[PDB]
Design a protein around this nucleic acid. Structure first.
Ligand SMILES: [Mg+2]
Ligand SMILES: [Mg+2]
Ligand SMILES: [Mg+2]
Ligand SMILES: [Mg+2]
Lengths: 113, 92, 96, 112, 75
RNA sequence: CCAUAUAUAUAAUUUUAAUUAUAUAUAAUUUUAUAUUAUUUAUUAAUAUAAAGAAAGGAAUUAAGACAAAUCAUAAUGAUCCUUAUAAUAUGGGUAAUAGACGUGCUAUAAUAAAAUGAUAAUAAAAUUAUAUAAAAUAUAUUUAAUUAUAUUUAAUUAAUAAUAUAAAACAUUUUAAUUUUUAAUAUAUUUUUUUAUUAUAAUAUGAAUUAUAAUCUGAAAUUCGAUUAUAUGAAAAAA
RNA sequence: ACUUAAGCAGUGGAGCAUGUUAUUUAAUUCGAUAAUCCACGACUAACCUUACCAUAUUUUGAAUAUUAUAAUAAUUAU
């Protein structure tokens, strides 16, 4: 577990789900609460269905909220489960995470944060 | 950028402690100080902008700027409004 | 100590005038600490978090081509219907 | 009587119970009336002012409802709503603090 | 309030209707300071359950209405 | 992994605490040599004596059974019950009542012990300060000042910078009821802050409960029911 | 071998504070009860906290969903 090498030890920063430091403690508490609420929302967002009898339950880990000076990055792992010519539901979900032009989730979260 | 920077001076780590009734928890604030010398304001603004753009997760930053220079109310604005209200103006 | 009090009073008055300070040699209660007290309303009010959060019900309007499922809500409805099958459901609320 | 409180107030985004709603309502109305309360208090507490003005200000202070009082606000746990053993550093009761701290939810917090 | 420079703890009261029609003033304001002009007037002060009727004297002035409506049974 | 000891790095040694800070690494679970005792005979162990060492502490880390626990406030699910009320809001009241009984703590019941005083300021650590913190000064209690408590005014600092905050016991002098073991008047002295002679000369100057009066503090509000100060009051508490 | 026993150092008959219990109370919110003992949480109960009492007052209420209406913005062809 060599600490001097970034391939041989887990950064201690990674054993917290919210990774942040604010000089303004009020804002840090607020950001922690925001991360917990968004994690609960994302958990709610991982179940989909293509009409009845077509339930799809994506399983995501806890979110990892990387707060830097000018950006927040919400990283999470997930597990799911001719295809070139349509988008399945999981693809639509992820594309609303980042790629939609009008009401993608990260813009709404940017306003929230 | 051409800036003389002394180095990340270790500053005292702040310890915060909490007792749960006897489980102990603590949080450590690590602090580094980098000082800049003999530089123009504009180059130093470039430094701050660049390092802000490419900052790391979980690190906060405070910047003090020292600029050598040549020598050369909500309550109050409401108290006036209340005193110029009929309820208070009638007693005066 | 030997300095006359008039000299120090003149110094205090002139200094207070320069630095925009209340000069109150009589020591009367002026309520100035009330004026100078900070407003704590915003920090106190933001205690429980930002209320303008995205909620599950908004998802139906933002992303109509995705039909999300709230497992908790579906379970609550299933339990409500299961009770109503046994005759253990809530009575009809009285109305005026 | 659609809303239990006189003034419509948005709900907090997380855990809810009746006591959290009561506390949140009082916090919102304290924010809204803080300047008025401070101005009235200043008028009441300024001995340069006439006694009638001070008495009128004190009367208006006593006439205000309970949901504008700063002393009525109580810090509750944002996760469980409990009002005992709340750590202000996280707005959590001690049990919720321990749970979240062991889950890694609280940034920087470690077992000692 | 308690510090004398702050003045009495005056509260709103239906006193004029009791100063013209001689009716009792029913109040839950147990913290109200009895002012000198309350003298003679009849009060009905809440004790938490009932309204103790009293008539204000000059010996009560300065005291508070709640002092004359005890809230707990003695035994 | 802490801590401890050491090395390197960093700090333009005015954010100074370089006697420091915090990153990285090293170290020990110590080792060697004799002598005496025992020995499963040494290449063992203990004791002692030498030698080299700064080296002497601590924490965490897995399961399996048994019983308890609904402030299980360590949850979830289910069942059951209320639905104009067992849900919800406001005003006031209570949780502070007092015959007892007990647990815990604080202050005491005096001389190996209490008090007062000690300014170029004896000597700390660890924390806290944007939902603050309050310096110095001035004014009143109040008495030359100091001390203590409030008020006035808010300097600096959102902090290795400024403030809370000159740590306190310690130590030194003085004082101290019971105690005629003392004080005082005269003499007296080579003990002079003192000696000697002759004359007079169970609760305190311990304790601080209770209560009265007047102020103050926070708060919109101190009545039930808060805290502080001053002037009075001055209880119980001695033995086993 | 927890425990006991021994030794050392204390504390321990009063006042107060704080809990529990008993009684009281409109309420004194809640906590034990198969015979040694033991109902006993407070990182702060004036209002809030609060759970309790009295009196007033609210009635789809804090949620999600359905169905209507009344507006408000976007789009069709009014
Ligand atoms: Mg409070
Ligand atoms: Mg004494
Ligand atoms: Mg109460
Ligand atoms: Mg109430």
């Amino acid at each position: 577990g060599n600490i001097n090498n970034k391939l041989q030890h887990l950064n201690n920063m990674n054993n917290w789900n919210t990774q942040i430091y604010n000089y303004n403690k009020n804002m840090e508490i607020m950001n922690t609460m925001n991360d917990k609420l968004i994690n609960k929302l994302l958990y709610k967002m991982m179940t989909l269905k293509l009409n009845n009898m077509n339930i799809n339950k994506i399983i995501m880990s806890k979110t990892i909220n990387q707060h830097s000076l000018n950006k927040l990055n919400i990283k999470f792992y997930y597990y799911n489960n001719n295809n070139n010519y349509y988008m399945n539901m999981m693809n639509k979900l992820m594309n609303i995470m980042n790629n939609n032009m009008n009401n993608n989730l990260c813009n709404i979260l940017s306003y929230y944060y | 950028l051409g800036i003389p920077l002394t180095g990340p001076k270790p500053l005292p780590t702040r310890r915060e402690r909490w007792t749960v009734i006897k489980e102990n928890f603590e949080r450590h604030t690590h602090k580094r100080l980098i000082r800049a010398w003999d530089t123009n304001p504009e180059v130093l603004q470039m430094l701050i902008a660049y390092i802000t753009k490419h900052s790391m997760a979980g690190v906060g930053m405070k910047c003090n700027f020292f600029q050598r220079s040549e020598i050369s109310s909500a309550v109050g604005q409401k108290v006036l409004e209340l005193l110029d209200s009929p309820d208070f103006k009638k007693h005066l | 100590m030997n300095v006359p009090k008039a000299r120090l009073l003149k110094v205090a008055e002139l200094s207070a005038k320069i630095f925009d300070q209340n000069f109150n040699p009589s020591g009367i209660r002026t309520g100035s600490k009330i004026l100078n007290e900070r407003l704590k309303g915003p920090s106190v009010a933001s205690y429980y978090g930002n209320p303008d959060i995205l909620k599950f019900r908004h998802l139906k309007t933002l992303y109509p081509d995705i039909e999300f499922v709230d497992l908790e809500e579906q379970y609550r409805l299933s339990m409500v219907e299961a009770k109503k099958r046994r005759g253990k459901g809530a009575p009809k609320k009285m109305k005026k | 009587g659609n809303f239990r409180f006189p003034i419509k107030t948005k709900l907090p985004p997380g855990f809810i119970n009746a006591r959290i709603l009561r506390d949140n309502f009082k916090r919102q109305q304290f924010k809204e009336n803080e300047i008025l309360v401070k101005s009235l208090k200043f008028i009441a507490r300024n001995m340069n002012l006439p006694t009638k003005l001070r008495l009128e200000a004190q009367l208006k202070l006593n006439a205000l409802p309970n949901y504008m009082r700063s002393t009525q606000i109580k810090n509750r746990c944002v996760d469980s709503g409990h009002a005992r053993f709340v750590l202000s550093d996280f707005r959590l009761c001690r049990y919720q603090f321990r749970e979240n701290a062991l889950k890694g939810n609280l940034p920087g917090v470690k077992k000692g | 309030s308690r510090s004398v420079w702050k003045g009495p703890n005056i509260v709103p009261l239906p006193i004029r209707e009791a100063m013209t029609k001689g009716t009792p003033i029913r109040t839950n304001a147990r913290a109200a300071t009895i002012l000198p002009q309350f003298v003679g007037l009849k009060f009905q002060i809440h004790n938490g359950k009932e309204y103790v009727p009293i008539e204000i004297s000059e010996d009560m002035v300065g005291h508070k209405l709640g002092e004359f409506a005890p809230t707990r049974k003695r035994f």
